[PDB]
Design a protein around this ligand. Structure first.
Ligand SMILES: C=C1/C(=C\C=C2/CCC[C@]3(C)[C@@H]([C@H](C)CCCC(C)(C)O)CC[C@@H]23)C[C@@H](O)C[C@@H]1O
Lengths: 236, 6
């Protein structure tokens, strides 16, 4: 029912790492290819995701103990979970009032129909919005939000992971840190957030399906970015 | 031509 100094520094490190890698102004969005409302939104949303992958990579490298894993394990964790961290970190820009991601003005307001114009269907998008709504209703503290992202990233049950025991140890430390934080700050919540990680596994599965079909169409794959082709690609 | 792992 108390946080140790080492647990406190882990929280401080993860929150500061998130502030370094998440810009609430969304001012870098003007450097993306402009949004257009076949697959007219694909250039903009590909630049958006590729930008976010860079931010997730930066956030991951500042998770305490992450840089001590082997480089191959760091990459395997990133490739398998990048889309889950992006969906998770996107909750900050999601809004319950209009059910969309608002990253500034109307140009950077991403409705469900916009992502339809990036090659995705309702099978992915309807559960994704439901995930955003259920996550938004939890009213997570910033400490809980960033701890959930770090826990999701350090899941050992990913393809290509070698040192499954060390990643398990790191994730357990973060789960312990998170469980002690929830105890102190709240009067249930831990189980719900762990359930959100199971939702992300399902969203990940559906996205990779729709991305794979998208990436094999040359007129569309040429609209992606080099980083998106690596992270979401099949080669390893 | 994942060295954004420096
Ligand atoms: C990125 C972030 C934000 C929105 C995330 C969104 C909204 C648009 C549609 C997205 C991008 C989903 C798409 C299904 C992903 C499709 C990517 C691709 C076309 C390559 O298959 C995933 C997350 C959704 C904005 C800001 O919160 C930063 C965050 O970091």
């Amino acid at each position: 029912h108390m946080l140790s100094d080492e647990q406190m520094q882990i929280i401080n490190s993860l929150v500061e790492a998130h502030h370094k890698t998440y810009d609430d102004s969304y001012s870098d969005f003007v450097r993306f290819r402009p949004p257009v409302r076949r697959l007219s939104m694909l250039p903009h949303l590909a630049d958006l995701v590729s930008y976010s992958i860079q931010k997730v990579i930066g956030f991951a490298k500042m998770i305490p103990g992450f840089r001590d894993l082997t480089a191959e394990d760091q990459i395997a964790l990133l490739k398998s979970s990048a889309i889950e961290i992006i969906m998770l970190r996107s909750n900050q820009s999601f809004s319950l009032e209009d059910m969309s991601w608002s990253c500034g003005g109307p140009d950077f307001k991403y409705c469900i129909n916009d992502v339809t114009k990036a090659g995705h269907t309702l099978e992915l998008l309807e559960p994704l919005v439901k995930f955003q709504v259920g996550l938004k209703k939890l009213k997570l503290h910033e400490e809980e939000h960033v701890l959930l992202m770090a826990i999701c990233l350090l899941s050992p049950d990913r393809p290509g992971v070698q040192d499954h025991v060390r990643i398990e140890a790191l994730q357990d430390r973060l789960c312990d840190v998170l469980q002690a934080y929830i105890r102190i700050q709240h009067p249930l919540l831990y189980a719900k957030m762990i359930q959100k990680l199971a939702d992300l596994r399902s969203l990940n599965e559906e996205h990779s399906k729709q991305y794979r079909s998208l990436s094999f169409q040359p007129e569309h794959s040429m609209q992606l970015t080099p980083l998106v082709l690596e992270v979401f690609g099949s080669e390893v | 031509x994942x060295x954004x792992x420096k």
